[PDB]
Amino acid sequence: AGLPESVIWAVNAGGEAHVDVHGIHFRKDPLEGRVGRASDYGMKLPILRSNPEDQILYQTERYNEETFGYEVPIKEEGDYVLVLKFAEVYFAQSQQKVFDVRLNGHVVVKDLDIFDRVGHSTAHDEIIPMSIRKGKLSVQGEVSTFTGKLYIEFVKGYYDNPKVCALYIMAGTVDDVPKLQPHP
Ligand SMILES: OC[C@H]1O[C@H](O)[C@H](O)[C@@H](O)[C@@H]1O
């Protein structure tokens, strides 16, 4: 199946619905009023590297001073890819904001420092392939029992607060995923 048809679940964190240049519908945030804090602070800033019709995705966020996450129902077995979108709209030095990302307890991104990787007010995406088959989740070579729901967690450490800007899951493999342009 082609791209928009292959997307099973997608969220614009801290914001309203938005359809991107690829036809992907990022839904209004289901955690509004529930857990964490929404911020539109980035709406004052141009976002580098992102396509300009879609910068609203990176200008809105959900963050928190304690660990928080999203629960995702997955109906059918198959191969999937999770895409996580971020931007640093406040700090402009390394080791100011740093956090881990976990999937059903497995640490899939260790010590994420958005500024260190891309700079200030600039798009950064993480791309995480996975498989759900024979009652198991498989990610980065580790395997555990899958019950029907995936728990995506952003973990509080010592350096400022965990955050996320947007996220989506598509059926397919990594070669099917649109990539951001190369960046120094
Ligand atoms: O709202 C502006 C900023 O407030 C806090 O510093 C948050 O930890 C940060 O993620 C956010 O970008």
Side-chain angles (χ1 to χ4, degrees):
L3 185 53
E5 286 83 26
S6 56
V7 174
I8 63 160
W9 189 96
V11 165
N12 184 19
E16 304 302 305
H18 181 79
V19 183
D20 87 351
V21 300
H22 309 283
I24 301 167
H25 168 196
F26 292 84
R27 279 68 159 183
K28 69 182 154 63
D29 192 350
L31 290 185
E32 175 202 35
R34 278 185 75 189
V35 83
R37 309 184 178 280
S39 171
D40 62 6
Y41 183 81
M43 301 184 56
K44 204 95 55 153
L45 317 176
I47 306 288
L48 308 180
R49 189 170 189 211
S50 168
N51 196 299
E53 309 76 338
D54 295 336
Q55 75 186 342
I56 192 63
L57 296 175
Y58 296 92
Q59 296 172 322
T60 51
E61 69 187 289
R62 188 161 293 282
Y63 77 93
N64 203 45
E65 323 98 86
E66 298 158 341
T67 299
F68 78 102
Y70 286 87
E71 271 192 290
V72 187
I74 304 183
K75 174 80 175 41
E76 297 295 340
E77 316 221 302
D79 298 308
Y80 298 95
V81 187
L82 168 67
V83 181
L84 303 170
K85 302 185 166 285
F86 308 92
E88 176 58 74
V89 300
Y90 194 75
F91 295 107
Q93 302 177 91
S94 310
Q95 291 213 141
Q96 309 298 291
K97 178 197 291 291
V98 187
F99 58 98
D100 285 3
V101 181
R102 310 191 286 230
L103 198 64
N104 281 19
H106 302 266
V107 172
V108 298
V109 187
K110 185 178 175 49
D111 294 328
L112 176 53
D113 187 339
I114 304 156
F115 175 84
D116 194 49
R117 300 287 280 290
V118 299
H120 182 72
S121 202
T122 303
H124 171 70
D125 288 12
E126 298 280 343
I127 299 174
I128 305 155
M130 67 172 82
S131 289
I132 293 158
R133 273 177 209 297
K134 305 194 161 310
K136 302 302 194 199
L137 166 72
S138 183
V139 58
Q140 297 178 352
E142 316 173 347
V143 183
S144 59
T145 300
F146 191 68
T147 75
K149 289 212 200 346
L150 182 71
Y151 195 32
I152 311 169
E153 275 183 303
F154 309 87
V155 180
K156 175 79 173 86
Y158 274 101
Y159 295 108
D160 210 63
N161 303 315
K163 73 174 275 168
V164 68
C165 297
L167 54 162
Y168 77 91
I169 299 173
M170 57 177 291
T173 49
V174 169
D175 285 347
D176 307 315
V177 176
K179 312 300 196 298
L180 297 179
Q181 67 184 114
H183 177 86

